[PDB]
Design a protein around this ligand. Sequence first.
Ligand SMILES: Nc1ncnc2c1ncn2[C@@H]1O[C@@H]2COP(=O)(O)O[C@H]2[C@H]1O
Ligand SMILES: Nc1ncnc2c1ncn2[C@@H]1O[C@@H]2COP(=O)(O)O[C@H]2[C@H]1O
Length: 261
Amino acid sequence: VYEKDEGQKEQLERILRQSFLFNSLDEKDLNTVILAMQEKKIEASTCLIREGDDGECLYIVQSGELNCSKLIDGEERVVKVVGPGDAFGELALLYNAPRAATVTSVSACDLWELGRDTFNAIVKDAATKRRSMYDSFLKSVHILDGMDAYERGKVADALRTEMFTDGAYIVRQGELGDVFYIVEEGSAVATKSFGPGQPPIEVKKYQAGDYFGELALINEEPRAANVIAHGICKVACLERKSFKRLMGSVQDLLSKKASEY
Ligand SMILES: Nc1ncnc2c1ncn2[C@@H]1O[C@@H]2COP(=O)(O)O[C@H]2[C@H]1O
Ligand SMILES: Nc1ncnc2c1ncn2[C@@H]1O[C@@H]2COP(=O)(O)O[C@H]2[C@H]1O
């Protein structure tokens, strides 16, 4: 029941590292969570979690789709579809509350289940601290100064962190771009080739609190420059879909500031 083969562990590690509540774990803590996780397969149209019940575990989806719904004014109202890579059933564990929605599979699903005790011991404090630290950080990132606390908190809830050592390319000129970056600590440099057959030249130096990688998202174009870690660089990362859905009018600010390049 805890036994997993190498293939299973590898796929589980990949999805866990990308999952918001687990993304801040060190590799050994993530390994301990992996040890604790139990596989759970369900057929389509299985009513897995029921609104109002006690919650003693959470799930992450390896494959399949499920609907989350709320019983409101006598009908089930679907409020979110979850699919591969998504975690669900975490709210009852994060906030010590009854299940806030019913979750039903739409297809056959392959899930991994984590118990409340392991979540409490290894994940819960780290996750809530990370969120708070993201909130603190964003309050000193000035392009977000126009947001209110709730807008900024939503962005904070969609951030992941990545570390890059000296010389590692965070983005490469001409590649597809689906991530917006803000430097949390360390440094980076942008270099840009101004035409075919021209080597790139340094065009900007980044420090903590600076952002980059917005142009591919706003303009729907390939990356316009390389961004390379200088010494070391720790970046907060916001995916394209979250950028578009959460940044609001900051997208307009970013668009207008593009003329400064
Ligand atoms: N809008 C929503 N409100 C509440 N729960 C939701 C929503 N969307 C998805 N869910 C998921 O449905 C789950 C129901 O169990 P939990 O309350 O433990 O955790 C909840 C979330 O993972
Ligand atoms: N002179 C410049 N031209 C274009 N992009 C730049 C320049 N200086 C820094 N950048 C950043 O480099 C990033 C490369 O990825 P993007 O095109 O998504 O967004 C770009 C900007 O954030």
